[PDB]
């Protein structure tokens, strides 16, 4: 399952007579495009790998 | 109520809450380099193959 989540502040009248706003005209734009399921774990780091990218020495 | 909006003038930001678009569009290259160098060469020689006798002396 794929989540596309959009908040943000509109002026009206940058809204085209469609209906239509392109996305680089909302204020507090938050954008959100995440997944679940086994293909979402898949690209997840592993717990010691991501220890270690925290915290060796290089 | 929204108060006095000009009919004929450009919609431009005016009060708090206005919103406004930034087009991001920065190019900016800095550079410098210098350089200095000297040199000196210097060669004498002097040789006397054949001495006559009466400068044998000196």
């Known amino acids: 399952t794929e ?4 908040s943000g502040v509109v002026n009206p009248r940058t809204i085209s007579g ?9 204020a507090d734009a938050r954008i959100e495009y995440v997944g679940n399921g086994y ?4 690209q997840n780091m592993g ?3 991501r220890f270690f990218l925290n915290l060796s020495p290089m | 109520n929204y108060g006095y909006q000009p009919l004929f003038e450009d919609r431009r930001p005016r009060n708090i809450g206005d919103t406004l678009t930034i087009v ?4 900016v290259s800095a550079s410098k380099s210098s ?3 000297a040199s000196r060469d210097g060669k004498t020689s002097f040789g006397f193959d054949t001495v006559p006798r009466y400068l ?3």
Request: aromatic fraction near 10%; avoid cysteine; hydrophobic fraction near 40%.
């Open chain 1, 3 to 6: 989540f596309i989540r959009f």
């Open chain 1, 18 to 26: 469609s209906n239509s706003v392109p996305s680089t005209q909302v």
């Open chain 1, 39 to 42: 293909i979402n774990e898949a």
């Open chain 1, 47 to 49: 717990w010691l790998q």
């Open chain 2, 24 to 27: 991001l569009q920065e190019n």
């Open chain 2, 35 to 37: 350089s200095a160098n």
């Open chain 2, 56 to 58: 044998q002396g000196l």
